[PDB]
Design an enzyme around this catalytic site. Structure first.
Site, PDB file in Angstrom:
ATOM      1  N   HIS F 133      23.624  45.784 -15.328  1.00  0.00           N
ATOM      2  CA  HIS F 133      24.133  44.547 -15.901  1.00  0.00           C
ATOM      3  C   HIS F 133      24.635  43.636 -14.782  1.00  0.00           C
ATOM      4  CE1 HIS F 133      24.281  47.915 -18.722  1.00  0.00           C
ATOM      5  NE2 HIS F 133      23.820  47.050 -19.634  1.00  0.00           N
TER       6      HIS F 133
HETATM    7  S1  FES Z   1      26.842  46.966 -14.647  1.00  0.00           S
HETATM    8 FE1  FES Z   1      26.639  47.509 -16.809  1.00  0.00          FE
HETATM    9  S2  FES Z   1      26.204  49.636 -16.306  1.00  0.00           S
HETATM   10 FE2  FES Z   1      26.991  49.166 -14.275  1.00  0.00          FE
END
Ligand code: FES
Ligand SMILES: CCCCCCCCCCCCCCCCCC(=O)OC[C@H](COP(=O)([O-])OCC(O)COP(=O)([O-])OC[C@@H](COC(=O)CCCCCCCCCCCCCCCCC)OC(=O)CCCCCCCCCCCCCCCCC)OC(=O)CCCCCCCCCCCCCCCCC
Ligand SMILES: CCCCCCCCCCCCCCCCCC(=O)OC[C@H](COP(=O)([O-])OCC[N+](C)(C)C)OC(=O)CCCCCCCCCCCCCCCCC
Ligand SMILES: CCCCCCCCCCCCCCCCCC(=O)OC[C@H](COP(=O)([O-])OCC[N+](C)(C)C)OC(=O)CCCCCCCCCCCCCCCCC
Ligand SMILES: CCCCCCCCCCCCCCCCCCCC(=O)O[C@H](COC(=O)CCCCCCCCCCCCCC)COP(=O)(O)OCCN
Ligand SMILES: CCCCCCCCCCCCCCCCCCCC(=O)O[C@H](COC(=O)CCCCCCCCCCCCCC)COP(=O)(O)OCCN
Ligand code: HEC
Ligand code: HEM
Ligand code: HEM
Ligand SMILES: CCCCCCCCCCCCO[C@@H]1O[C@H](CO)[C@@H](O[C@H]2O[C@H](CO)[C@@H](O)[C@H](O)[C@H]2O)[C@H](O)[C@H]1O
Ligand SMILES: CCCCCCCCCCCCO[C@@H]1O[C@H](CO)[C@@H](O[C@H]2O[C@H](CO)[C@@H](O)[C@H](O)[C@H]2O)[C@H](O)[C@H]1O
Lengths: 85, 71, 383, 54, 244, 167, 124, 55, 55
Positions: F133
């Site tokens: 993410h």
């Molecule tokens: S940034 Fe969402 S899982 Fe590590």
């Protein structure tokens, strides 16, 4: 065939007086040495035959059976084993 | 050397001499019987396992405690 | 009114363990009932604990038992306690049954507790048999194989039933997992039947060694029998301690420390010692189905004692001939036990058959005859 | 004896407190006693006896 | 059955651990490990024993870590999912000589040498059987015995013909504590070590048993006094009957 | 007499005392089966060397299934981390709170957002970047940008030697 | 078995001279070895009483006989729990071992068995 | 209790078995959480961790 | 020594990768899930699979 305290189902009792003394007033081991020696001897002597006779009989039967079985599976018992099977 | 070697020899010559003789006699008979021809086509071939067991059982009875005492 | 009598829940406990009216003259053989309750409690506690560490899958079962022995804190104790208490359970149950037969506890009005008792004994056998399979050593597997194959004798459907029990075509993972589930269940069923036979008994109360009514002279269960039970509890715990701590493997078979191998057959496949007399009875009959019937009959025939005992007197305390016959019956039962673990060789084959005939003839011939004759001797002898 | 009875035995609350305190003492002292006795009868045999070589 | 089919029964040797109050001799355990490692481990695994199990029984933490660290064990795959090895840790099990049964049998003329972790419990006789077997190979089989090829005569083994040859000879091991490594001495040490491997709780179990025996005995004695005390009014009861 | 009663209560009391001590021993030894078994206690406490690890490198040690990032941080890396004002930090911590030794950043190498393993040396704060993410961790392994709420967890670790840590 | 059965069979034996000559001495020895007299019991005290028929026979005992039976049972229970035997006058002498209950149970059973027969009568 | 409440209990037994049948045969997963069909993974944390509805 | 055999009906359909590490290496770090339970392991079931593949 059994009731409960106060109506246990005994025939009416009359004329028996029962007496006993407190556990704190009594010596619990009074007469223990006499009991341990003479009472146990009497009780054991009177039941000895009922143990000795069956135990000795079945031990004898076992002893004979196990000794024969042992002998049949030696060299000497070859022929008798052949017949037995 | 292995302490057991001497203990076993002593027990065989001593308390277990009768058993030693029976084993010896048996081996003599069996070896002689194997020497004879048409032994391979015999019904019963004798061994000396029984006699060996009687001797070893005897040696062990006379040695077990002595052996562990010197280890 | 005292709370223990007024409150319905407390009153149920009160009726069984506290105010319960007992004969004043129960001897130490009336202590096996509480020892059996103790074994049942130990088996529940140790068994549930083992279940927290045991894996029922055939690929992991034997090793989960080794993990219990080696890694689980006090695992060795819990495992040995469970395995040895299974043997103690049978010593106590044979003693309890022997008491019942000697003292006539099966006679009216106690036929119902005795009959439920016979089922308790069948449940204990099944429980112990399934628990022994769970180790999945050599004796576990081969014992499961030979005992489960006895069902193949049932006519027409026998083979189908065996495959259904195994969940496959031989003893394997499906069998082990179902035995685990049933082994966990069966002790609870056993506890219910144990409770049922006590509720049935409560209508007549305990019998006593003289065989007469105790309605004339009752003692409260507590404190008298509570404190008398403690003596045998501590004697039991001493025997338990000697086996569990000093000789934990004396009652077992070394082959059960070899993992199950369907290929290699062990030298001798025998049940645990407490099943040996029934195994000797089975061997005695040459027919497969015959042998199974005889073996089951050997337990179910206990149900006819109320009928074949023709005595007007309850129990053997005053019956010299009955006492001799009972002594021979008991020793014969021990000899059958021994013959259950000998090799099928002469002369033990014929001896096993003779002992089996004696076992059944006790119920069918000797007890009916001896009890009839003793009736006549009591009557004529006291005229 | 009267005094002892009156202090430690007469009230069951006190009797049970004395029994439990005694059990605590027993447990700790028995542990120590058995440990020493076990080490004496099995002297030179245990790891603690040979550990110093290593 | 013939005695040969059963195997000769081993003598009862006086083991240090025989005796309600007796532990193993840990010096003998350490020497027995050295016999295992230098002789038996060529053919026999000890798969239920981890390196941590030796610690504070036969070896210190450092000695056992050193034994573990000399070996390579399978690690988790690397980031491309390729296989990797790591050095051993105390948590690792002692690795066996063969990868599978087939390899083991191929190396031993068809016979499979058993894992030795439970062998002292898996055989009637225990330590005595192991000692008797290892020291009981006669120079010559009793006259008349025909051994199958690759079999060795040993009377303690049921049937007499064992696939394992004699392996203990005077001085095959040089003990690190200076003990003369005779056949008998090595058999005694390795039998003791294998007994420990089968039942590592042995020493603790017997000490806890001593405590239990003492407490339970005292409780039994007191329970007799208390029962007699409570029962005395019933036992002492007397009657006078005046028929109505 | 009081002596008479006291004797029998001594016997009763002794029996109660041994029953209490026996029950306590029984309960304690028996229930201990539920505490971590020896094989479980062996899988805790991973020991790792530090001599092998060069400066400016990050190791990955497995510990309780989870990966452990061990970075041997250089002087300038430590400096970079000690700069960011604690005030502006989702999870406000300075490196001194995180490390017990400035040259050994020890962290549980699973991202605090959902639980991917961040690719190290990448990022935008040049520490670790979770690709899942896009959450960026620092050289302290503090969260700077992205959905992740917390800084990369620190296990309980001690330096037994100066060359070996246990986790 | 019913008391009726036992009494009838006994009477067949006591009739036959041969049978009585061999059975009566055996029965007397049996009773001596049985040892119930050494707890102060009479033979009839031992008969199983937890039956409708026996409960009815016991209710028909004269009050005196009934009070004495209660005392013998209590006394025997006290010997049993103490592991003692009767001594002196507590031992039942052969002349005191009277069949006090047999006539009552025989009457109860006579009626019970006649009732069973008559419940199965067939008008001819 | 019998026969009145025995036969009145049968009505609700059959009503219950109808509801049971609709879930077990036609919608067996309606009351469950899809995440329980993913094997436990100590690393990945589920979006929302909730107890079963009745808690 | 290790050997191979041809497949039988009892065999499971084999996956493309030997382990997770290999799977992630081939998919830029992502692990493609096993698809045997995916229709039950996602809210939406068939609709989610269809929507995702075409969306
Ligand atoms: S940034 Fe969402 S899982 Fe590590
Ligand atoms: C297993 C777990 C451990 C728990 C142990 C519980 C066992 C206790 C028990 O039931 O038996 C004790 C029990 C003592 O119990 P008791 O309540 O004093 O008397 C019971 C008998 O009915 C009373 O029998 P009696 O009064 O006629 O006395 C007979 C007894 C003598 O009994 C004595 O104790 C003396 O001696 C023998 O019968 C020995 C036989 C002779 C051999 C030679 O011992 C026996 O009497 C065993 C006799 C069996 C044969
Ligand atoms: C072995 C053979 C045992 C036979 C017993 C004969 C009677 C005897 O002497 O026992 C002592 C005592 C005699 O007790 P008693 O109650 O008859 O007499 C007490 C004393 N008098 C007569 C004065 C009232 O018997 C028992 O206590 C017997 C209990 C039987 C338990 C058997 C267990 C065997 C398990 C196998 C199950 C299938
Ligand atoms: C197993 C648990 C043992 C707990 C021991 C704690 C003290 C209780 C005890 O031993 O009994 C004393 C007490 C009382 O024994 P007691 O009833 O003989 O004492 C009453 C009379 N006085 C107070 C004058 C001594 O037992 C109980 O209260 C019940 C607990 C049973 C254990
Ligand atoms: C380990 C297990 C044994 C430990 C419990 C024994 C009690 C310890 C001492 C306490 C005590 O003696 O006080 C009595 C409590 O006993 C009691 O109230 C219980 C009496 C005996 C204890 C257990 C009963 C066993 C009977 C059945 C065994 C079941 C085995 C099956 C699991 C009350 O004394 P008091 O009440 O006489 O009056 C006296 C006036 N207050
Ligand atoms: C379930 C199995 C029941 C049988 C119990 C036998 C002993 C088991 C306990 C372990 C043990 O050996 O305890 C020893 C002491 O003996 C003892 O003191 C225990 C003997 C007492 C036996 C009966 C007492 C109570 C048993 C059941 C009561 C249950 C209620 C609560 C659990 C060792 O002592 P340690 O050093 O291991 O002890 C730790 C604190 N020092
Ligand atoms: C090079 C081979 C080899 C060596 C070295 C070896 N063994 Fe064995 N061992 C075997 C084989 C093969 C068997 C299986 C024999 C059989 O079943 O016929 C065996 C069997 C055994 C058995 C079990 C016999 C039985 O009852 O089943 C024990 C115990 C044993 N070995 C212990 C040892 C000990 C202790 C050592 C050395 C200190 C040792 N072995 C050394 C090959 C070996
Ligand atoms: C009457 C009660 C019980 C009896 C007679 C009994 C008997 C046995 C026996 C004979 C074994 C073989 C023991 C061995 O040699 O290792 C065993 C194993 C086992 N029993 Fe029980 N059991 C009983 C109650 C329970 C209960 C309630 C559980 C609860 C799960 C249980 C769980 C187990 C487990 C897991 C094993 C296998 C592990 C082991 O062998 O120790 N048992 N049982
Ligand atoms: C789990 C197994 C069992 C338990 C816990 C148990 C428990 C008890 C208890 C506590 C009593 C009352 C006290 C006593 O007389 O000892 C009793 C009585 C009895 N039990 Fe059991 N029992 C069990 C198994 C059996 C079996 C297998 C039988 C019969 C085959 C049996 C038949 C009886 C009978 C007939 C009585 C009445 C005896 C009498 O007082 O005269 N029980 N049982
Ligand atoms: C032994 C394990 C201990 C737990 C006890 C077992 C729990 C289940 C027992 C309940 C089964 C019903 O058991 C039944 O209860 C009632 C009252 O409780 C008893 O009733 C008895 O006691 C009460 C007063 O104590 C009297 O009103 C009654 O006249 C008498 O018969 C029955 O004799 C018993 O058979
Ligand atoms: C109803 C219960 C209410 C709550 C009670 C909670 C009990 C549960 C706690 C488990 C406690 C175990 O705690 C731990 O026990 C073991 C024994 O078991 C002890 O261990 C000690 O004795 C054992 C044998 O008994 C030896 O093997 C060991 O080497 C020695 O250290 C530890 O010194 C103690 O730290």
């Amino acid at each position: 065939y059994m009731g409960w305290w106060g109506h246990m189902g005994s025939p009416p009792q009359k004329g028996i007086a029962g007496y006993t003394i407190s556990p704190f007033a009594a010596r619990p081991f009074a007469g223990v040495v006499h009991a341990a020696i003479f009472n146990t001897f009497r009780r054991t002597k009177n039941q000895a035959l009922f143990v000795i006779l069956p135990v000795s009989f079945f031990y004898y039967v076992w002893t004979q059976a196990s000794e024969k079985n042992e002998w049949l599976y030696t060299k000497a018992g070859r022929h008798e084993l052949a017949k037995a099977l | 050397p292995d302490p057991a070697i001497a203990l076993h020899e002593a027990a065989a010559e001593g308390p277990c001499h009768d058993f030693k003789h029976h084993f010896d006699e048996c081996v003599e008979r069996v070896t002689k019987a194997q020497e004879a021809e048409d032994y391979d086509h015999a019904e019963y071939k004798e061994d000396c396992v029984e006699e060996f067991f009687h001797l070893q059982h005897c040696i062990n009875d006379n040695t077990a405690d002595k052996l562990f005492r010197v280890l | 009114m005292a709370l223990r009598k007024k409150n319905s829940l407390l009153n149920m406990a009160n009726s069984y363990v506290l105010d319960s009216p007992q004969p004043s003259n129960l001897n130490y053989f009336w202590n096996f009932g509480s020892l059996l309750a103790l074994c049942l409690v130990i088996q529940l506690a140790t068994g549930i604990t083992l279940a927290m560490h045991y894996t029922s899958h055939a690929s992991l079962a034997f090793d989960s038992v080794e993990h219990i022995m080696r890694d689980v804190n006090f695992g060795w104790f819990i495992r040995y306690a469970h395995a040895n208490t299974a043997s103690f359970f049978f010593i106590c149950i044979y003693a309890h049954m022997g008491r019942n037969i000697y003292y006539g506890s099966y006679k009216t009005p106690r036929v119902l507790p005795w009959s439920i008792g016979v089922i308790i004994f069948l449940l204990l056998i099944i429980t112990a048999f399934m628990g022994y399979v769970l180790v999945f050593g050599q004796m576990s597997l081969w014992g499961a194989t030979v005992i489960c194959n006895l069902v193949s004798a049932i006519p027409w459907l026998g083979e189908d039933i065996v495959h259904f029990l195994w969940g496959g075509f031989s003893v394997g993972n499906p069998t082990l997992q179902r035995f685990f589930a049933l082994h966990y269940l069966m002790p609870f069923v056993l506890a219910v039947f144990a409770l049922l036979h006590l509720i049935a008994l409560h209508t007549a109360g305990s019998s006593n060694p003289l065989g007469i009514t105790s309605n004339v002279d009752k003692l409260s269960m507590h404190p008298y029998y509570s404190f008398k039970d403690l003596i045998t509890v501590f004697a039991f715990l001493l025997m338990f301690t000697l086996f569990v701590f000093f000789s934990p493997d004396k009652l077992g078979h070394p082959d059960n420390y070899i993992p199950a191998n369907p290929m290699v057959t062990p030298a001798s496949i025998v049940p645990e010692w407490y099943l040996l007399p029934f195994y000797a009875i089975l061997r005695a009959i040459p027919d497969k189905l015959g042998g199974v019937i005889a073996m089951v009959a050997a337990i179910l025939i206990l149900l006819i004692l109320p009928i074949v005992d023709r005595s007007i007197i309850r129990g053997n305390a005053f019956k010299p001939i009955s006492k001799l016959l009972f002594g021979f019956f008991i020793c014969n039962f021990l000899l059958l036990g021994v013959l259950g673990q000998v090799h099928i060789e002469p002369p033990f084959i014929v001896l096993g058959q003779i002992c089996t005939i004696f076992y059944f003839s006790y119920f069918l011939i000797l007890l009916p005859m001896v009890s009839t004759i003793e009736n006549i001797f009591f009557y004529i002898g006291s005229l | 004896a009267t005094t002892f009875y009156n202090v430690f035995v007469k009230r069951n609350s006190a009797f049970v407190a004395t029994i439990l305190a005694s059990a605590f003492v027993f447990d700790m002292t028995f542990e120590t006693a058995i440990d020493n006795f076990w080490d004496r009868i099995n002297a030179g045999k245990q790891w603690k006896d040979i550990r110093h070589k290593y | 059955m013939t005695a040969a089919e059963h195997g000769l029964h081993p003598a009862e040797y006086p083991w240090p651990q025989n005796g309600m109050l007796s532990t193993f001799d840990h010096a003998s355990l350490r020497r027995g490990y050295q016999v295992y490692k230098e002789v038996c481990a060529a053919c026999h695994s000890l798969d239920r024993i981890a390196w941590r199990n030796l610690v504070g029984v036969t070896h210190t933490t450092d000695e056992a870590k050193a034994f573990a660290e000399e070996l390579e064990y399978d690690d988790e795959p690397d980031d491309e999912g390729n296989p990797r090895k790591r050095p051993g840790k105390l948590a690792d099990y002692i690795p066996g000589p063969y990868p599978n049964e087939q390899a083991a049998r191929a190396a031993n003329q068809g016979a499979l040498p058993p894992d030795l972790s439970l062998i002292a419990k898996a055989r009637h006789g225990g330590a005595d059987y192991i000692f008797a077997l290892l020291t009981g190979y006669p120079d010559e089989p009793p006259a008349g015995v025909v051994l199958a090829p690759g079999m060795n005569y040993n009377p303690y083994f049921p049937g007499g013909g064992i696939g394992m040859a004699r392996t203990l000879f005077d001085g095959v091991v040089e003990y690190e504590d200076g003990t003369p490594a005779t056949t008998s001495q090595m058999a005694k040490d390795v039998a003791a070590f294998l007994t420990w491997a089968a039942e590592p709780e042995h020493d603790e179990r017997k000490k806890l048993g001593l405590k239990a025996i003492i407490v339970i005995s005292a409780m039994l004695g007191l329970s007799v006094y208390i029962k007699k005390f409570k029962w005395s009014p019933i036992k002492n009861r007397k009657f006078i009957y005046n028929p109505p | 007499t009081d002596a008479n009663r006291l004797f029998s209560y001594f016997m009763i009391g002794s029996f109660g005392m041994l029953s209490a001590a026996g029950a306590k021993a029984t309960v304690q030894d028996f229930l201990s089966n539920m505490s971590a078994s020896a094989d479980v206690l062996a899988m805790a406490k991973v020991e790792v060397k530090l001599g092998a690890i060069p400066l400016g490198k990050n190791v990955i040690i497995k510990w309780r299934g989870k990966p452990i990032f061990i970075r041997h941080r250089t002087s300038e890396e430590i400096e970079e981390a000690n700069e960011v004002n604690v005030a502006t930090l989702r999870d406000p911590q300075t490196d001194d709170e995180r490390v017990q030794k400035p040259e050994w950043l020890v962290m549980i190498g699973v991202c605090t957002h959902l639980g991917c393993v961040p690719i190290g040396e990448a990022g935008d704060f040049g520490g670790w970047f979770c690709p899942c993410h896009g959450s960026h961790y620092d050289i302290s392994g503090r969260i700077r940008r992205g959905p992740a709420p917390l800084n990369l967890e620190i296990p309980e670790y001690d330096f037994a030697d100066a060359e070996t840590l246990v986790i | 078995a019913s008391i009726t059965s036992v009494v009838k069979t006994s009477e067949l034996i006591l009739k036959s001279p041969l049978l009585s000559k061999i059975v009566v001495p055996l029965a007397k020895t049996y009773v001596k070895f049985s040892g119930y007299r050494q707890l102060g019991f009479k033979m009839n005290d031992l008969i199983i009483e937890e039956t409708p028929n026996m409960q009815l026979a016991l209710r028909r005992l004269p009050p005196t006989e009934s009070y004495d039976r209660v005392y013998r049972l209590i006394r025997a229970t006290q010997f049993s729990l103490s592991h003692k035997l009767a001594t002196g006058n507590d031992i039942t002498k052969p002349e005191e071992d009277d069949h006090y209950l047999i006539p009552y149970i025989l009457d109860v059973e006579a009626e019970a068995f006649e009732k069973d027969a008559l419940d199965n009568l067939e008008v001819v």
